Amino acid sequence: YTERDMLQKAADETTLKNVLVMKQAWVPYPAYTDRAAWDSLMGSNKQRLIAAGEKLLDYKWQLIPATAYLEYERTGNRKIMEVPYDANRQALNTLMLAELAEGKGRFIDQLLNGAYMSCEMNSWVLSAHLPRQSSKRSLPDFREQIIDLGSGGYGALMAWVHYFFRKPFDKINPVVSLQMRKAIKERILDPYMNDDDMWWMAFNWQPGEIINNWNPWCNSNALQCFLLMENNKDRLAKAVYRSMKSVDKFINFVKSDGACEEGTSAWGHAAGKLYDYLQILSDGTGGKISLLNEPMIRRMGEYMSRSYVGNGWVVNFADASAQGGGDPLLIYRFGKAVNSNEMMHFAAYLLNGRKPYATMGNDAFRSLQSLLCCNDLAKETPKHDMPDVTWYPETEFCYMKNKNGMFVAAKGGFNNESHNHNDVGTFSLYVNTIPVILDAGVGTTIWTMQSNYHNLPMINGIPQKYGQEYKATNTTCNEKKRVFSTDIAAAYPSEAKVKNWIRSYTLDDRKLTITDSYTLEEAVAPNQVNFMTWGNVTFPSQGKIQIEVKGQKVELDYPTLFKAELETIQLDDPRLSNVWGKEIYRITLKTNEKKETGNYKFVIQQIK
Amino acid sequence: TERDMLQKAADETTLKNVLVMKQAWVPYPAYTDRAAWDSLMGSNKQRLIAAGEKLLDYKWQLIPATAYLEYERTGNRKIMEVPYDANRQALNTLMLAELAEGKGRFIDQLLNGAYMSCEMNSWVLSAHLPRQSSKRSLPDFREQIIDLGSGGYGALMAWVHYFFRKPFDKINPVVSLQMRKAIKERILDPYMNDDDMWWMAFNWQPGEIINNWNPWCNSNALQCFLLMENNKDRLAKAVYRSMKSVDKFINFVKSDGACEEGTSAWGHAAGKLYDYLQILSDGTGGKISLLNEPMIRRMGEYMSRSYVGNGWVVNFADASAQGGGDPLLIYRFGKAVNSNEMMHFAAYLLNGRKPYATMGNDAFRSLQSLLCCNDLAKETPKHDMPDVTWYPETEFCYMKNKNGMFVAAKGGFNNESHNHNDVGTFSLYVNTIPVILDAGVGTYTKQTFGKDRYTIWTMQSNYHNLPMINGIPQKYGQEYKATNTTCNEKKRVFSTDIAAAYPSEAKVKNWIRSYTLDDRKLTITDSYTLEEAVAPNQVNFMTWGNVTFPSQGKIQIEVKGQKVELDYPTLFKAELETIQLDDPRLSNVWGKEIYRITLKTNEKKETGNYKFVIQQIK
Ligand SMILES: CC(=O)N[C@@H]1[C@@H](O[C@@H]2O[C@H](C(=O)O)[C@@H](O[C@@H]3O[C@H](CO)[C@@H](O)[C@H](O[C@@H]4O[C@H](C(=O)O)[C@@H](O)[C@H](O)[C@H]4O)[C@H]3NC(C)=O)[C@H](O)[C@H]2O)[C@H](O)[C@@H](CO)O[C@H]1O
Ligand SMILES: CC(=O)N[C@@H]1[C@@H](O[C@@H]2O[C@H](C(=O)O)[C@@H](O[C@@H]3O[C@H](CO)[C@@H](O)[C@H](O)[C@H]3NC(C)=O)[C@H](O)[C@H]2O)[C@H](O)[C@@H](CO)O[C@H]1O
Ligand SMILES: [Zn+2]
Ligand SMILES: [Zn+2]
């Protein structure tokens, strides 16, 4: 945590008040009643958005019974509530886009139905999240509103529906728009301003607590609601400034190198929602209050490009999946806003030759924003080019590649990272995008979290220990040599009796060389070294391992003092078997030798 | 008439001294008292449990804004009402089921229904919402009015609250909390704070209607207050307000007890007056009761006296000739006013069925039906009544003989509720079967209300059992009326002067129409003095079935195994006019066609008289 306070430095309340754009004149989308301009913006999305609306002409708005909320308390079941909720939210979002697309009034009755139904609900908070209310119960209490991820999203959608359709709604019956205004005030505007204690707001934040994606996510949703629904200038400025203060807490908490330590799947709702907030704030101040030119924000964006190896494979340290991806439309808009050419071409590359279409789902802002960027992204040329080395020195992540298709990811860190795995000093090797030395990733400390099942030694036969203090020391990257080095000794407990253990990775054009150099206090038990892999693993001769997997072939050359064995790991958990298939392997390297000082060299290269 | 029977029985001060607090008046066992529920339920137990089980996966139905908008767009009520009623019926059935079983199996669904009901902006029907300030068919979250629907919804919610508060609060006390709020917002407060709801009749003046809405809504509100309002000062004020409101209704109906609309509203008119009086009595420990008032007994006995048999009811005015009733209701009302006739009639109306709990959506009638089943089951079926019933102010006369003839006749005036131009008419039934009929109610058209009402054949005296005097029919209007109407009960003679129901053009001084029923025959007479003989009189009779003319002056009618001869003056030429029935509301009663017998003559004179005789033959 560092006090940058970038937003507060861009303005105080008074300054902000002077640049706030009133009466919703900041809105970038045309008027509902502009068949011509919507037609231009939409292009080929039009027919498709109309077709999606047509499928909802007879959609029955789903009631959420009290028992669905009670179920959270009874059994911890969340989906019984969330499925109908999210179905309603998506229906309302789609209908919005379809009516913007068609403009013939045909989807207005269903929009009005969804909006009216939504006001009758006692709350838009998820059943899993409602226990943060005073009562601590999972059922809505009409006496209190809080804000959560869901309720903020629902609020912003409702605000956008109000914004586009109030005029035709009012013609049918003005009480609908009236009650939407009350609902948004009671469930978003007022709680936001009157309750300092919501955990994601990060006011009263002490060391040891979390600030995560909830902060920029909920603040971006609150901000839209104010910008759309609050027409008093003093009230507006106070809320917007409040949001600036709250987001500063997140910006202060995340490391400047810009790595997202939760991975490429958290990216879209962490960095991605910081971006959204900042786009929203810029738009709302006529671009006068903008952090989109800040280099930390570009680095936070580019993590998504750097961390994406290819064909759906991504770097997956911690409790994260080796298969991931991202929203190419979001990535384009984020890249274009921070002037990352790399991000823009990377978005066109992820399209994998498909035409970009409107984002659906239930996030009104991204849906609407997707409409703006479409023609542009369709014009963008696809490439995934990036430097040979990326070095995140505070997060201690290092990516190194060569022109022959090897990509290595390595890390230092500490055994209390977000969604920790005990993995200080580990690496992952990809060849032509395919994992060859892998990181197992996330189940549904289980074994996937143990250093025993990462690409690491068991020093004196002992694994890494969990804990803040169990950490890398002296992590370095030589960007030009493609050398990563760290001392992992302090990640192990006392009984490991190790003074120093340097693990280093050197990638040249032909090979990856892995070294271990150690000094022990006492040689108690033989070291063991493990590697994780998959596919077709053979042992053609002593000191040699061959790995054949999705068209790739390498050899791992290892010291002849070790005995190599392949351990089969059946994957019954589907969240793992959906990535890797039915089984993966741990190669164990074991020995009878025990010395106080020594070293190992391992060499991985492709072969014919 | 300013009877003010309830205000005479107590004022607010008396009331306050006799109200029973803490719902100690409730006549049902505690939910936890399983032995007492089992004894009360009898064979209803397993029936109600099975009905409950059918609803364990019931999905509570949302009502979309467009369903309410549709009333305005097209007049469609059912789009809104069908899911609404389904919800209410499910909630009512689940209450009964859970009372029957007592194991907590239906609690979750009761909770769900209750919570869903709180989230609705309003419980008012779409057709009724346009009485709000905005005059729209969509709820307005800022404002509540009460209607037929919302009152019943409110009462049902109050009963759910009363029975299941404890197991609800075990789950999550916020549900009961929101229920109390909802009932307060939607029933208690509007009832107290708004003096201008049309059905309360606090602003009533001559010309305006008081109808069934009054006792029906008052009785629902009264329940809510007795269940939910624990401040005795607020309770007394509410109850006394309901007494003043319901007095408007009692003042308005005729003391002779005839429901002039006819039997089809009896269940929700006199029957809801009964419900209101029972609730009031229960809530005051019996201290404020009009259940002993002879007028209330006559109101309830009207349902007996007007029910001929086999689904056939007396149907003057715009009313179906087919009707019926809820035997359980009829029994309870009968018992309460000490009417053996009504209690035996209820048994008769069961048609040999065992009495089971009332289902539907009326929580009070469902619960009350549990209390009465065992005794109604024991009651002997009979439909006994005096040979003559004479309603002297409404001017309805029913006369019967031991050989199966039932004659209904009326005086009155051509501005009665749901009026037909029918002063002086009669209807004859033979072993319950209509033989000289009164066509009754058709499907509403634009012409049904307004001028042109009397261009609809069913409304005209031309198509009732009456003369066309100098070829002229009766005219609509308050002063088009009977005079010198008498009934000799001993001799079974009804007589009336119908001259003044006819316009000037009919140029008639007097026309006495009289009905004499003996042990075998009905004699109909006309005796007339015209001002001038313009045109020949015509006399009409309405009938159905198989109509034949074996000789001059004779007609035979055979219908549904009954057979009669009609003897008419040979001066008349008799023709049979076929009336093919396009309208299902008619054809569902009468079949494909009915007939008008026309009796016509070239005679024309200032005075004369006609005799007709109807007797059973073959
Ligand atoms: C119970 C509780 O309070 N747990 C907190 C924990 O909060 C949890 O954080 C999760 C997170 O990963 O951020 C939440 O997961 C996300 O919830 C969303 C709301 O239902 C859902 O929308 C996410 O998925 C995306 O939504 C998009 C849309 O808005 O259109 C889609 O288009 C998108 O592609 C879709 O995937 C969902 N993420 C998932 C499933 O990975 C969860 O609601 C929440 O409970 C806190 O982070 C931690 C912090 O220490 O404390 C716990 O106690
Ligand atoms: C639309 C409107 O306001 N109409 C007013 C009349 O009220 C109607 O009276 C009917 C009646 O009591 O027969 C009502 O019918 C009943 O409705 C309840 C609730 O849905 C239901 O339980 C019954 O089965 C049903 N009975 C029927 C159909 O016979 C109807 O809801 C109601 O709209 C009012 O009588 C007249 C009086 O002047 O005014 C109209 O404006
Ligand atoms: Zn891992
Ligand atoms: Zn009639």
Author numbering:
A (entry chain B): 26 to 469, 481 to 644
B (entry chain A): 27 to 644
From the paper:
In bacteria, however, a different strategy employing a class of enzyme known as polysaccharide lyases (PL) is deployed. This enables PLs to operate through a β-elimination mechanism that relies on proton abstraction from the C5 carbon of the uronic acid sugar ring, resulting in double bond formation between C4 and C5 and elimination of the preceding sugar. The three characterized PL33_1 enzymes were all from Bacteroides species inhabiting the human colon: BT4410 (BtPL33HA) and BcellWH2_04512 (BcPL33HA) are hyaluronidases from Bacteroides thetaiotaomicron VPI-5482 (B. theta) and Bacteroides cellulosilyticus WH2 (B. cell), respectively, while HMPREF1181_01744 (BsPL33Heparosan) is a heparosanase from Bacteroides stercoris CC31F (B. stercoris). The enzymes are 68% identical and contain a larger N-terminal α-helical (α/α)6 toroid domain (residues 21 to 401; BtPL33HA numbering used throughout this section unless specified) and a smaller β-sheet C-terminal domain (residues 402 to 635).
The complex contained two molecules of BtPL33HA in the asymmetric unit, with one molecule containing electron density for which a trisaccharide could be modeled, and the other for which a less well-ordered tetrasaccharide could be modeled. The side chain of R103 interacts with the O2 and O3 of the +1 GlcA, while H154 only interacts with O2. No activity could be quantified for the mutants N238A or Y291A. However, it should be noted that although both Y291 and H444 are positioned below the beta face of the +1 GlcA, they are too remote to directly abstract a proton from C5.
